[PDB]
Design a protein around this ligand. Structure first.
Ligand SMILES: Nc1ncnc2c1ncn2[C@@H]1O[C@H](COP(=O)(O)OP(=O)(O)OP(=O)(O)O)[C@@H](O)[C@H]1O
Ligand SMILES: Nc1ncnc2c1ncn2[C@@H]1O[C@H](COP(=O)(O)OP(=O)(O)O)[C@@H](O)[C@H]1O
Ligand SMILES: Nc1ncnc2c1ncn2[C@@H]1O[C@H](COP(=O)(O)OP(=O)(O)O)[C@@H](O)[C@H]1O
Ligand SMILES: [Mg+2]
Ligand SMILES: [Mg+2]
Ligand SMILES: [Zn+2]
Lengths: 216, 70, 90, 343, 140, 48, 188
């Protein structure tokens, strides 16, 4: 009987081989890099291709359902517009270029007069990031962010690098005037990848200078 | 043959159909309607279509392939 | 200055970016923005229009500004953005 | 064999998928006849399109998203309305699950606001049995920071309805017509998403003469009063329009179907301070006994937000220390710094 | 005093195409959008004739003309002039009736009070001891 | 070439931006060498 | 295409009459079926006449070299071949069953309520058209009546919206009455 099981194994092995060869010869290249907007239930997703055209898919294609999530950047066929392979993100390379670790060391000795503001930032961050156990125990929710408003030349960028300097962290700087790209869906992808990268790394701070570029 | 010709004439109004705005009339059985695709085409006009509904703003329907006022 | 304001969106920022990149590639480069008021008007919110396009070009220029030396000339310096006139860029 | 069986069935589903082709997402804009539609692609031209036989004609109303075949150009199936955080208005903001007990010492004012707004939205049967059109709009006036916005969020949370918060001083823009245009867009927005709590901030900018800029405030005021009470749809949305100076408000802005019921919310009441400290300091871990009367007497003329800053700053003092709140001296210095440094 | 409510009743009782616009809706920014909106309103009344245009609170954009010294008053005077042209101009609109409601009746431009543009200047006074009885009876 | 995938360091499956047309995942022609195409540099692709 | 050109060349290697045909499913959406056969013409035959045909008369028949295909290369790299479809009996007869009705069809009485509604609607439209006909005929304006009959041609009142409508209503009425009488005769 073991020979019968072996024969079934070999037959289904060559069946797997032929279906795999069909899949491989239907994969080929190129793929249309498309961004899945959402996933409707009634195994079918609404894709917006990089060609600025949306195409509903009756079936998802050569991928598995729960792996796909709203916002996933995948590669689809140029004609049938069907998901072929999920494309890894890797946070591009520009996003990883903004984790700058040559912090010019704005020690609080290099910033004068902005003392109470330094202490207010260190009350809003640092201790929430460093000594967080007591912060959970108290029930004081630490504000996730601070907005540095002030007349130009006040030193907002300086104190930002300062509290990025003497308080460790990764300092993923995400300055606003950078976050405007004539390519559609690049700035938004930049922000989402920056936050995903901040999730990936150790305790860090996302810093956005001149928010008016996108904050209008 | 005449009922046949009328039948294929009606068939040209099948329902793959783009819509364009009737910009201007040139002369009988032709037009300059610009399609919604983004281009303006010098087209032909069906005889069955009455010319008095061809006001110079009408959102007329065009053949998908031949791109003619149908 | 006229070229740094293009019809298509984002082309002015790209223009200034490659201008600064070419300037950096050269050794001891000088840039002279004659009539800065064309691309240096005071910032205000005008999203429903093309004004923010040259606005974002100016913001990208400020980002580039803050061996390279930069020159700017204007007969109405009161119309320039205070951020651009601060002594970190000029 | 079994694992091979499962993955081979999945691979055959993939093989069938490879033959399957995509559909252009489109939106129906008109229905000429019972087999004719005007469907516009998301980014594309408009096509005269028919419907598949296994599809209900009625469901394809103007505005119904569809996914037509991209070769025959025929509708194959309907799609529900597209969802995305692309909304330009405050509706997507959630007021937060805050109860009426969270705001302390406004029991009478809370009750009047419930009677004015909660009743027409929850049980209109009383109002229709009496024979009166349900009241719409309540005006909360008081010192700034006293908690009118918190009250609005509490109502919007209990009623489980969408909530719009707007700074009325922001809506008056220098350019002509945008001030009234913002109110217009706000109201037409509330028409689509119902029921709606239209909480407007300090109205004295909008509500209450020989220059164009002054007649602009008149024009936006008329637009507002037309939006609340008048033509089109009398609607069911409610407004929690709150002000800081009630005498400035236009008398026409105070009418029954036009934002009646001037609720006075004065600075936290003498007994209300204790309740506010209980609700906003109780969450803070503190084993030590409290002399609340002493804090209340040391906090005279305080506003509701000040007590929350006292609690947060006492927590901060604890952060700069052991970690546990044990002593009243902390509440004293917190009150003083929320007294002198918040001036 | 029932100015808006009578127009509402007319709209509920008309076989024509009622087109309500508020006076504040014509005051749009981007000069050339308000007068263009007036042009669109009257044109829309034109194809779907017979049609009725109810312009409530016209005192916003139909105040007496004067020597405007900025684009601000120039644009509102332009809206008023476009109203005058479309209500009675070189293009006589037929089967297009206009109801217009104001609370002042004296700031209105004299050209707009002409008996060729606004023929009937109906006055809605405060209810007397007789009308108040009827209003109470109908509401109650 | 905005990104290099490097699926197995032998079939890199480069991602290319065609400016206005679209963004695609493509491979080299046999003529050009794998090491000549470095990230971010301008590349020339065929129409097909 | 050029790739199609090479593909046809490879097919011609096995046999020098390996035809290549193209079928466009979208243009052939109706009675017209756009299908043109092609065979590669040898690039070494430029010395002699392209389309090397001989005594015949069917070169211009059944088609005229299309503009849509001429610019992509016709009579230069590949030449079209006249298309002819072998359809015979016992095959067409099976195909006519696509829309053939049945014995039940032709005896149904339609629906009398909507039949009366349609008859009344057509009669009313005939009444308006007869008012128009009366106006036009009684006008009988004689300032060049031959030019009057050609300055008012827009598919209107005189005859096109005349008896053609009488044609349809009379056809419907006679068919319905004949079917009704046939049923009263056959069915008891
Ligand atoms: N409080 C301060 N102490 C020391 N140096 C300061 C201080 N404030 C500003 N500076 C200096 O002045 C300059 C201001 O640049 P910086 O970008 O830090 O300020 P900013 O207010 O954030 O600027 P901008 O708003 O134009 O982006 C820097 O060279 C900085 O070193
Ligand atoms: N009466 C109150 N009871 C409890 N908390 C209050 C009260 N008043 C204000 N607060 C606190 O102050 C914060 C902001 O108050 P806000 O609603 O902005 O006051 P206002 O509406 O008067 O401006 C709220 O988050 C709330 O926690
Ligand atoms: N004759 C009336 N009968 C009943 N209600 C009336 C009468 N006149 C005015 N009203 C009430 O006055 C309110 C204001 O409406 P109206 O006077 O038409 O608008 P406006 O104040 O702009 O003239 C309405 O809600 C209406 O119920
Ligand atoms: Mg800065
Ligand atoms: Mg009114
Ligand atoms: Zn081909």
């Amino acid at each position: 009987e073991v020979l019968r099981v072996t024969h079934e194994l070999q037959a289904m092995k060559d069946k797997i081989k032929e279906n795999s060869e069909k899949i491989k010869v239907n994969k080929t290249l190129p793929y249309l890099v498309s961004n899945v907007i959402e996933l409707l239930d009634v195994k079918c997703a609404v894709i917006k291709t990089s060609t600025r055209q949306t195409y509903f898919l009756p079936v998802i294609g050569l991928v598995d359902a729960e792996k796909l999530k709203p916002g996933d950047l995948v590669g689809v066929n140029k004609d049938s517009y069907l998901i072929l392979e999920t494309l890894p993100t890797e946070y591009d390379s520009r996003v990883k270029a903004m984790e700058v670790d040559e912090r010019p060391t704005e020690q609080y000795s290099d910033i004068g007069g902005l003392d109470k503001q330094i202490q207010e930032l260190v009350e809003a961050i640092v201790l929430p990031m460093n000594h967080k156990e007591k912060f959970e125990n108290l029930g004081i929710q630490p504000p996730k962010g601070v907005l540095m408003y002030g007349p130009p030349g006040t030193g907002k960028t300086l104190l930002a690098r300062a509290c990025a300097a003497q308080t460790k962290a990764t300092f993923l700087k995400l300055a606003g005037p950078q976050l405007v790209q004539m390519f559609i869906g690049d700035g938004a992808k930049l922000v989402r990848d920056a936050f995903a990268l901040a999730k990936e790394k150790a305790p860090s701070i996302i810093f956005i200078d001149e928010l008016d570029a996108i904050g209008t | 043959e005449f009922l046949h010709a009328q039948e294929e004439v009606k068939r040209i109004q099948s329902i793959p159909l783009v819509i364009g705005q009737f910009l201007e009339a040139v002369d009988q059985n032709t037009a300059i309607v610009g399609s919604t695709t983004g281009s303006n085409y010098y087209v032909r006009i069906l005889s069955t279509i009455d010319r008095e509904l061809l006001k110079p703003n009408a959102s007329v329907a065009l053949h998908k392939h031949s791109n003619a006022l149908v | 200055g006229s070229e740094l304001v293009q019809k298509y969106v984002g082309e002015g920022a790209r223009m200034v970016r490659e201008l600064f990149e070419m300037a950096r590639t050269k050794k001891a480069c000088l840039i002279f923005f004659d009539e800065i008021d064309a691309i240096g008007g005071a910032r205000f919110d005008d999203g429903a229009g093309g004004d923010n396009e040259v606005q974002r070009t100016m913001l990208e220029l400020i980002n580039q500004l803050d061996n390279i030396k930069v020159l700017m000339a204007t007969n109405r310096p009161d119309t320039l953005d205070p951020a651009l006139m601060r002594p970190g860029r000029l | 064999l079994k694992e091979l069986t499962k993955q081979y069935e999945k691979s055959e589903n993939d093989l069938k998928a490879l033959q399957s082709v995509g559909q252009i997402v489109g939106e129906v804009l008109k229905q000429l006849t019972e087999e004719k539609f005007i469907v516009k692609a998301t980014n594309g031209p408009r096509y005269v399109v028919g419907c598949r036989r296994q599809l209900d004609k009625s469901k394809l109303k103007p505005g119904t998203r569809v996914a037509l075949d991209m070769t025959t150009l025929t509708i194959m199936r309907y799609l529900p309305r597209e969802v995305d955080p692309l909304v330009y208005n405050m509706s997507h903001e959630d007021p937060g699950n805050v109860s009426y007990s969270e705001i302390g010492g406004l029991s009478e004012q809370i009750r009047e606001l419930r009677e004015v707004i909660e009743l027409p939205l929850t049980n209109p049967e009383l109002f229709q049995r009496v024979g009166i059109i349900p009241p719409k709009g309540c005006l909360l006036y008081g010192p700034p920071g006293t908690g009118k916005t918190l009250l609005a969020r509490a109502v919007a949370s209990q009623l489980d309805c969408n909530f719009l918060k707007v700074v009325s001083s922001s809506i008056v823009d220098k350019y002509i017509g945008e001030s009234a245009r913002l109110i217009r867009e706000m109201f037409n927005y509330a028409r689509d998403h119902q029921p709606c709590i239209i909480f407007m901030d300090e109205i004295d900018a909008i509500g209450g003469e020989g220059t164009s800029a002054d007649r602009e405030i008149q024009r936006t005021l008329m637009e507002l009063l037309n939006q609340m009470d008048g033509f089109d749809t009398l609607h069911r949305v409610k407004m929690i329009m709150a002000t800081n100076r009630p005498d400035t408000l236009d008398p026409a802005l105070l009418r029954p179907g036009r934002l009646d019921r001037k609720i006075h919310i004065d600075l936290p009441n003498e007994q209300a301070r204790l309740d506010i400290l209980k609700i906003h300091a109780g969450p803070i871990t503190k084993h030590g006994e409290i002399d609340y009367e002493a804090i209340v007497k040391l906090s005279d003329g305080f506003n509701g937000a000040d007590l929350r800053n006292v609690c947060t700053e006492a927590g901060m003092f604890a952060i700069r220390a052991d970690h546990d709140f044990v002593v009243q001296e902390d509440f004293m210095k917190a009150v003083r710094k929320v007294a002198d440094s918040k001036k | 005093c029932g100015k808006t409510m009578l127009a509402k009743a007319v709209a509920h009782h008309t076989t024509a195409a009622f087109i309500r616009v508020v006076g504040s809706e014509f005051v749009q920014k981007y000069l050339g959008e308000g007068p263009r909106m007036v042009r669109d309103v009257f044109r829309l009344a034109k194809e779907n004739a017979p049609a009725i245009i109810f312009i409530d609170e016209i005192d916003a954009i139909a105040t007496k003309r004067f020597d405007a010294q900025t684009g601000a008053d120039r644009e509102v005077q332009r809206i008023l002039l476009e109203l005058l042209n479309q209500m009675d101009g070189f293009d006589q609109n037929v089967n297009v009736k206009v109801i217009m409601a104001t609370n002042r009746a004296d700031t209105l431009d004299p050209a707009l009070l002409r008996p060729g543009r606004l023929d009937r200047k109906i006055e809605f006074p405060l209810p007397d001891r007789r009308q108040k009885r009827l209003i109470f009876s109908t509401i109650t | 070439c905005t990104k290099i995938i490097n699926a197995d360091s032998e079939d890199p499956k480069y991602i290319i931006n065609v400016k206005q047309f679209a963004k695609f995942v493509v491979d080299l022609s046999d003529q050009v060498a794998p090491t000549d195409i470095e990230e971010g540099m301008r590349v020339g692709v065929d129409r097909n | 295409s050029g790739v199609d050109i090479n593909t046809q060349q490879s097919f011609e290697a096995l046999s020098e009459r390996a035809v290549a045909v193209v079928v466009d499913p979208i243009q052939s959406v109706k009675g017209k079926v756009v299908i043109d056969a092609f065979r590669l013409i040898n690039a070494n035959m430029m010395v002699l006449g392209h389309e090397p045909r001989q005594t015949t008369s069917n070169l211009g028949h059944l088609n005229k070299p299309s503009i849509q295909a001429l610019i992509h290369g016709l009579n230069r790299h590949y030449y079209s071949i006249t298309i002819n479809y072998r359809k015979n009996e016992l095959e067409q007869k099976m195909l006519l069953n696509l829309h053939k009705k049945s014995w039940m069809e032709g005896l149904t009485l339609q629906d009398y309520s909507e039949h009366c509604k349609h008859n009344e609607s057509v009669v009313k439209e005939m009444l308006e058209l007869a008012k128009n006909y009366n106006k036009a005929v009684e006008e009988e304006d004689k300032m060049t009546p031959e030019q009057l009959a050609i300055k008012n041609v827009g598919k209107q009142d005189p005859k096109r919206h005349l008896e053609e409508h009488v044609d349809v209503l009379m056809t419907s009425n006679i068919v319905q009455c004949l079917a009704a009488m046939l049923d009263t005769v056959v069915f008891k």
